[PDB]
Symmetry: C2
Subunit: 352 residues, 2 copies
């Protein structure tokens, strides 16, 4: 049947002093009847969301800054101070619940050296378990500069991730600037989970692949939410296009291109979570391609409801077991894959 | 178990007088060893691609303008003249092979009424079978203006599609303007099939859904290539988000929103093709969600090779039949779904 001790690791917060900014996210992502709960959860890591996690059989929650978080702060010095404030805040909150809470670093991604230094501080001094970054870092006096991490200057940062041996969770963020105006103004309800989020993350991680990040750093670990941000349904089409067009075309120009097949990266460097994607059928398709050991349960609180995400995994245990290859695979996805990936010791309900 | 008489309907051409424009497409989409074949095929609807189609068991090819085609022509008067020339040209070419060739209208989509009139001319006077439009119509310097068809003025055009009772094929196109520079300059090999194409089409058709196009025009027929442009893998997540967030939020503001579940539109208004997606596993997943009667074989020539797409469907007939639910489903996908959708009479090998 169902299990306790599940690990959930796409679980967002904001600094309480910025409560007013969370009402702006609520207007993008939260139905009216869910506003009271959203505001309580996003501002209280140890509040009712912890009680729900305990009731619903979560053993370890890894908290991260919400979106865009620092990636929406276009002034470098202000962005760097905010990221540090987020890390110091969540470190203080999780200190009282070490058996069931951890955190991922919030980072200013304006400068690779500075981001590497803050990640190192979070991991070595605060015991954080990785980084979670909300897609491209926006920058410039009017915010139009889009900083992607698949360019060579970011190699110092990837080297830091590998040296610390912690994963990088690439989370989505809403559209900004001319992209928001040109492509979303007339379909604003498509901002967020319906399409815009995965459109951005898939572009960015495929960018890391085709620009050779994982070839230069074969030990690098990256996590994608939402069962891989559109990519698994296109595993065949993307790899086929790389074989039929992209690889020989790039080679003919002397341009950098990924050295391995698409699935190699998804079987060695990338892990997927079930955040906001409580779909047994989609989970099955993903398992069939990447392996049950490469998918991690997660909720996506507070944008999703802990009781709903845990309810799916718990209440459909038998059907999910059939879909993912048996009892061990089900416990691996629920808990044991993440326990091993994050090198967690004993934690709440971890052997239950 | 293979069949002849297959229908293939994402098969592109360019006007011979614009041969020079095809070189820019080759630099985006065609490996060096495939250039000679691409140039021959894109400029000769009755050339070797017809010989290959006859050899490989295609009974009916529906030709369409390549991409962006008119959607990249930013000046309305020139765009309208080009679309007319494309339609008159392809009408003349297919006249010599009526038993095995048809066409979809090329349209200037600067003005809903003007596009409606050209579609009517193509259907009523030239016998065309629908329209194929390459995503948003570009206008303005560098194409920075993006004209989407999910805004209320486009109801004039949707009413025309319903009056004529023909489908609208929403095909992808490359990025333009600031989006091209900001989001693709550092990952240029992701322009096209790897991600950019489906990112645009999925945004656009989901836009039509959430702005209520299919609620006001429940008889409207739309076709998507590439097994649905990322949407099927996200069927659960999109509909869940619409239920949990978007529909109650829009209702609370009095904003228009899709009245029915996402899968209703994919089971009533939208058909998928296999263009560029010769994946038995992805096809199976789509069949399980939308029904085998809603998926149409297609190749995507000349960007894909007719021998490769037909080779997949023909050589793996037994495995595909098992994946899609049996012989009738296999013949439906190969031929009979399209025969019925486009009301084709007898055609070459149509009872084979
Ligand atoms: Zn999230
Ligand atoms: Zn095509």
């Amino acid at each position: 049947g169902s299990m306790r001790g599940k690990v959930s690791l796409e679980e967002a917060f904001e600094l309480p002093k910025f409560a007013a900014q969370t009402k702006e996210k609520a207007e993008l992502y939260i139905a009216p009847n869910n506003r009271d709960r959203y505001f309580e959860e996003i501002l209280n890591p140890c509040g009712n969301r912890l009680e729900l996690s305990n009731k619903h059989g979560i053993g370890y929650t890894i908290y991260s800054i919400y979106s865009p978080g620092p990636q929406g702060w276009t002034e470098r010095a202000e962005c760097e101070e905010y990221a540090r404030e987020c890390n110091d805040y969540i470190s203080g909150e999780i200190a009282n619940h070490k058996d069931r809470m951890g955190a991922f670093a919030a980072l200013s991604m304006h400068d690779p050296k500075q981001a590497s230094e803050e990640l190192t501080r979070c991991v070595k001094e605060l015991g954080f378990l990785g980084a979670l970054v909300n897609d491209v870092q926006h920058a410039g006096p009017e915010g139009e500069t889009h900083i992607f991490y698949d360019q060579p200057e970011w190699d110092i940062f990837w080297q830091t991730c590998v040296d610390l041996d912690v994963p990088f969770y690439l989370h989505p963020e809403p559209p900004f600037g001319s992209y928001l105006r040109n492509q979303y103004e007339g379909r604003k309800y498509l901002i967020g989970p319906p399409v815009s989020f995965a459109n951005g993350v898939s572009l960015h991680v495929l960018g890391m692949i085709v620009n050779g990040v994982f070839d230069r750093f074969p030990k690098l670990k990256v996590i994608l939410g939402h069962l891989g941000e559109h990519i698994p349904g296109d595993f065949w089409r993307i790899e086929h296009w790389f074989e039929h067009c992209s690889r020989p075309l790039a080679k003919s120009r002397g341009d950098v291109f990924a050295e391995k097949p698409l699935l190699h990266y998804f079987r060695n460097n990338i892990w997927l979570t079930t955040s906001g994607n409580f779909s047994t059928e989609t989970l099955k398709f993903c398992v069939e391609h990447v392996g049950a050991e490469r998918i991690l349960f997660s909720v996506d609180s507070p944008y999703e409801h802990i009781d709903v995400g845990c309810g799916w995994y718990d209440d459909n245990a038998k059907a999910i077991m059939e879909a993912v290859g048996g009892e061990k695979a089900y416990k691996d996805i629920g808990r044991d894959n993440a326990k091993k990936l994050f090198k967690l010791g004993k934690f709440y309900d971890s052997e239950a």
